């Protein structure tokens, strides 16, 4: 990501971000009920949402 995300328009980033949070909620909901085997996914989604929001902030006020 980061280069692949830098491309996409603001309207697009915000859409992807909604899916990221929707995924984050489900993955929380998985491990929560004791069903998530792939622990490392929680970290991934979280660190990706960060990139999105860093890119959104660099696009909006620059």
């Amino acid at each position: 990501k980061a280069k692949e995300l830098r491309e996409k328009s603001v309207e697009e980033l915000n859409t992807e971000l909604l899916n990221l949070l929707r995924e984050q909620f489900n993955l929380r909901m998985q491990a929560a009920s004791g069903q998530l085997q792939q622990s490392h996914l929680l970290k991934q989604v979280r660190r990706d949402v960060a990139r999105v929001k860093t890119l959104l902030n660099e696009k909006a006020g620059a």
Binding site: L18, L21, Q24, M29, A32, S33
Partner: protein, 93 residues
């Protein structure tokens, strides 16, 4: 009132125990761990949108984290918000 980014961050995990069971099987109430900052309205909203079910009423309570001693030094578990979400008679999940 609400937003999608917030409704997603609000619900955190479901809470299991013999009371969270009898609550479910005898009164159609789902016991949940919600964000400490989550209002009763924000839980109704999130449980209706993210779980697609009809919420009757939400009752909330804040649980105090237990303190454990390790000799001279102590530790304190985090404080959390428990949410009793009753649902209208058409039970699902």
């Amino acid at each position: 009132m609400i937003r999608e980014e917030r409704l997603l961050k609000v619900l955190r995990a479901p809470h299991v125990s013999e009371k969270a069971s009898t609550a479910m099987e005898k009164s159609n109430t789902i016991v949940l761990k919600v964000a400490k900052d989550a209002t009763k309205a924000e839980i109704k909203a999130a449980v209706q949108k993210l779980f697609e079910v009809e919420v009757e009423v939400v009752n909330t309570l804040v649980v105090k984290g237990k303190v454990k001693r390790h000799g001279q030094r102590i530790g304190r578990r985090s404080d959390w918000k428990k949410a009793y979400v009753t649902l209208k008679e058409g039970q699902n999940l």
